């Protein structure tokens, strides 16, 4: 006669984290990362995956909101410049390129933009794509397309945790996996 509690545990570093496995669809729970209000947490894993970020890249690339506060975090570390893909068209943006985004939950309506001065940064750079946990991979399928879209050459990806299937060509601190309702 109550609800289910259940977490997973995460530590990055020693930073300790027991997720809440919560439901997201008929038949399947996950572990939620929360970064938001959790500096010690955003930290931790932006100093892991810088750790893990070679010379050679000279951007990083993250989506909103996903990547905010690690592509900031790891900007903040290694020195070097970052962009975020944006969800919504914004004034400032002028001549935008767009990607849709693959979604199960709801399709069609997802969407990543750059406006050309986000584009200029990219173009002819080797980049590293950031987001917070990879799932289906519809978000990195759209960074991919919006990196090559506007120039640049996605050198590397980063992500604290990859979800469901695992993923080898991906630079991940750990992985998540997909719980039943
Ligand atoms: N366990 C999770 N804890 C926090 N956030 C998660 C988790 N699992 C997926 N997410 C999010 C939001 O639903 O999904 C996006 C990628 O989804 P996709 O790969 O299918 O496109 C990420 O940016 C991230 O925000
Ligand atoms: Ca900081």
Do not use: W
């Amino acid at each position: 006669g109550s609800h289910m509690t259940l977490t997973h545990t995460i530590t990055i570093g020693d930073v300790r984290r027991e997720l809440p496995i919560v439901r997201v669809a008929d038949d399947a729970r996950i572990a939620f990362l929360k970064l938001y209000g959790d500096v010690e947490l955003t930290v931790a894993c932006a100093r892991a995956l810088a750790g893990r970020m070679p010379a050679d890249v000279d951007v990083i690339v993250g989506p909103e909101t996903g990547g905010i506060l690690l592509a900031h975090e790891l900007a903040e570390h290694s020195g070097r410049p970052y962009v975020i893909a944006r969800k919504k068209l914004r004034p400032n943006m002028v001549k935008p390129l767009r990607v849709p985004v693959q979604s199960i939950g709801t399709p069609g309506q997802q969407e990543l933009f750059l406006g050309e001065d986000d584009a200029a940064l990219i173009k002819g750079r080797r980049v590293a794509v950031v987001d917070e946990v990879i799932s289906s991979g519809g978000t990195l399928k759209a960074l991919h397309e919006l990196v090559a879209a506007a120039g640049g050459t996605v050198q590397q990806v980063l992500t604290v945790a990859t979800e469901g299937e695992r993923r080898p060509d991906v630079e991940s601190l750990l992985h998540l996996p997909v719980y039943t309702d």
